[model samples]
Target chain A: QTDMSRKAFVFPKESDTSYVSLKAPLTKPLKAFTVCLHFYTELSSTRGYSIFSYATKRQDNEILIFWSKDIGYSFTVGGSEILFEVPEVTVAPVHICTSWESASGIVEFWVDGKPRVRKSLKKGYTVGAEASIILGQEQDSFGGNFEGSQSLVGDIGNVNMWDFVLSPDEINTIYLGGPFSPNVLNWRALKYEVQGEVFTKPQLWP
Target chain B: QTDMSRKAFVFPKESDTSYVSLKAPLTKPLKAFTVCLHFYTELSSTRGYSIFSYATKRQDNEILIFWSKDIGYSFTVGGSEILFEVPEVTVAPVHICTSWESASGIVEFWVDGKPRVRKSLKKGYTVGAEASIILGQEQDSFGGNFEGSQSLVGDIGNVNMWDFVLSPDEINTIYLGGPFSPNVLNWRALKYEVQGEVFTKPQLWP
Candidate 1:
């Protein structure tokens, strides 16, 4: 069963700011498999953009891993922490490929093509607000208001969520187009769906 | 004489889901020629390569006159109001770019191609100890320890402050390694300063 909501996470450059999030509050303290999220941001914080995520250990978003053009991660994580190694070369589009395995049970971060950080969970984390979804700035404090003034800085596209782990090769394929090969959209994700578009069918490339 | 203890304005980034604000309790209304800011955002916030500036009611940061990858101004100040537009195409470097400004006067913003924002307040706004510099993320709710599970998604580079605004051309010279022109500092760019021999002389480029 699939429910592709019309919610589109639009980091619009036209409006004051835009927000959209997915609240994938795992019911069970997920033991195995991988959970992946995708999105983009501009370079400035005042541009009215956001992509705050929460899971495992919480982040500056107190959410977990925070990837940006500048500072990669807020604190740190585990596995392929390369997601936070932002290069200093002429600005280029960044591709995030993160993963976590049941063996390690740590958050692995990767940026473009380098390793960023890796963090282990103190304790397995569960869902917040039961099963919630957030988007566009925010919906509730836990997920409402795009925050307005402090928007994200860049363009975001082809965000594909996966309940299972995606190998490196699979990540490349997904990046090209996307399989949309995951399961339900986490209610948490729904909460952050400010102006996002949901896909009915899997948006896979090749 | 420069007083580092003197607090400037700072907007800390709260959790990815929220925002933080920064204000000063300055007694005097100071005229600004330059300002420094440290931006901290998550990977999601840094979508593709693009520049995202918000409404500051300044001609330099306007969505006109200066809106071009080459020129690098989002807008311009003309009549009474400032115009808004879509995100600029100038890609954001993965690393931070200490911005500077030379556009002086009572302004909402003064961003120079050298990478900086300035606002020479005809008169300073309300000064309060409420906030001057913040970390992690920033927005309305502004700041807090974040939810029990949430946290900040990024880090901030040590931001420098200056009381003068640098000119666009001067800033360009700085970026080109000509001399010390503005108060902005591309953290990584300082690497050159660490070279055995320092280019201590600040020269003006024609």
Candidate 2:
């Protein structure tokens, strides 16, 4: 059985700013959300490297995941930033999973099947649907203004987004390299457009 | 039995920039050289796309293989340029092979097992020992100054380089996905360093 369906979007951290752009806006509102993906990189910079970002129309209403030399993970949801510190990993690719529930205002972060951090905020915050979702580079506005220092120089794969929080056990198996289900977005059935010079194609993980 | 040895380096064609840098310098020679690889692209640019480039310390001692909208294959050997026009192919990945001989100053370009162009130039041209070799971007100088317009935006794989010209029968069997020998470089045992953001890693052809 030869099943090599997983692919990645390779980002070259150039000054011209190559990134993956998705017009497919996330469905927002009353409840829960989850995002999962695999990322590999060897470059370390003090400035910042963006993993994902979604800029909503409302001021300061943005969701982002960025990393700096000092800070490992700076996750922002509805402008509320939560910082998580992790040891620098240059040996292998990392698998990450995040979940949030509006009712409980609880947010969770998982790395390689192990839970990392948890927080509670914005009890009734309903994310905006009219937003620009992007990978590789952070978006200050709705679509453009990408900084080269904040760009990723690595491979991203197995992206999945869901409308509801997944169980801890479910998150554990995300890296099993098998068939699974995702509600909002699935890498196997990716529905997005690549803007700029981004190459969103299937690739083998190094 | 399966040999999952083929790999690729994806480029994002960002202006006159973006390329894969190789630290493995070619052995200085007074004889011949051969380069074989697979490339895939859906982009049609008025500006040319460089698949491979090797520049010597001398001003005009250069070897280049590129594609242009106007001129399909713009192959250069020691300051002499031979242009070969080809039909636009948007079907799938395109296989290309180029070779040069110092004995006869003969240069040949092959696309998909069919010979495209042949020329004779600088018969005794000895490629400089300390040379700069790159993929996806052209080298204006010996090593640096890559123009974005000439950068490749697609996938490249199965790269093989030899210090001696390969036989026509061997070249014909290259696409058959078999075992062969390359004197200088082989994709299976690639011994090169990736400069900038070009990843010489295994990947599924896009």
Candidate 3:
């Protein structure tokens, strides 16, 4: 049992076997969702890197945040993906939040509190409940099939998830370090398991 | 002679005649330089906008920071220009720093403490001394010829400039509110005149 609310997971190096497993409290299929996190990395390569991965038996790429060099960040849902062109990632820490709803299929990607162009993906699809959530490694199968080429090498912190899409004001509040509670996967009381070379350290900034 | 260290210039609307004239303390030509500022705006259109402009008798676009809609942010030096692709600007505040040198003509652009790809421009040229520096409106002539289409509409704060290119550590320190001083134009003790309807107000964040 670990509380990573004020701490960050530091992946010091790239490895296919290193990751952090998150135990979600969700029992029902998700029709809409939002995930936000802060990260800093010095990794810049032509290879694809994974930020968050939610894999289920029905869909291996069910709700993944993967970065493809030059092609922008990809948000995958139920095997379908949408790419959002973001600023070039560097050693500086970045805050990113992404939201998606099934009805309109509208996807909102916010980087450092600034919203990108609204995009649509995976209309009318319900993400499965029994999912394997992991950080730092992409999953080609349910909770397995990791690749070194897709490993994250940096510090990731302040992860929170909500069941529904957040309003602009709420998202801005979160970005500004204001008070807000995330119903699903709250960072303040996060329950996660560290696997292989991952260390929990204090965040360098507020 | 006003201490604008904790203040910001607010441009309420777009206008060709509206601007803030800054009196720079420079007698000789500059061989190298770095400029940093914080800005927030709601203006997004096909028309180009100006952030900072330094115009001289020899070149109207001498050391200018201009943004084109589809194109990227242009950093002009002695009539020559280099473009840097940045993140989409929104109402959220952004911090940007740009540096240039004469011998090698290397240009460095940083947004929110993240460095973009290094570029080169105007290798053997020296920027003219007697110049007209302004905020909000681009100058076509030495000290006049403003355009409403290139005017900025938002809050701009913490304008600082050094005579030499700043190190990455020093730039990051300034972005994080660490101690540093600008030899050329210091925002803490700014000397300027407000033309038209530009307002000086308290900054929203640190």
List pairs with backbone clashes in candidate 3.
none
Tens digit of per-residue lDDT, candidate 2, span A69-142: 76688888888887888776543577888888888889899977789767886778877677778888778776
* Error in Å for residue A23 of model 2: 3.1
DockQ of 2: 0.03
Instruction: Please give each candidate's TM-score.
Output: 0.38, 0.52, 0.52
Task: Please provide, for model 1 over B1-206, each residue's C-alpha lDDT reduced to its tens digit, 9 standing for 90 to 100.
Answer: 22212122222232243333323333442334233333233333333211222122222222112222233333332222332233443323222223222222233232333222222222223222222233232212323222312323333332333445444454445334453523322322321111111112211121
Supply candidate 3's per-residue lDDT for B189: 77
lDDT score at residue A52, model 1, on the 0-100 scale: 39
lDDT of 3 by residue, A116-158 (tens): 9998887888888898899999999988899998898777889
Arrange candidates, best TM-score first.
2, 3, 1
Better of 2 and 3 by lDDT: 3
Q: How close is candidate 3 to the true structure, as a TM-score?
A: 0.52
DockQ of each: 0.02, 0.03, 0.02
Per-prediction interface RMSD in Å: 13.9, 16.1, 10.0
Model number with the top DockQ:
2
Q: Which run of 10 residues does model 2 chain A get worst, by summed lDDT?
A: A197-206
Error of 2 at B191 (Å): 19
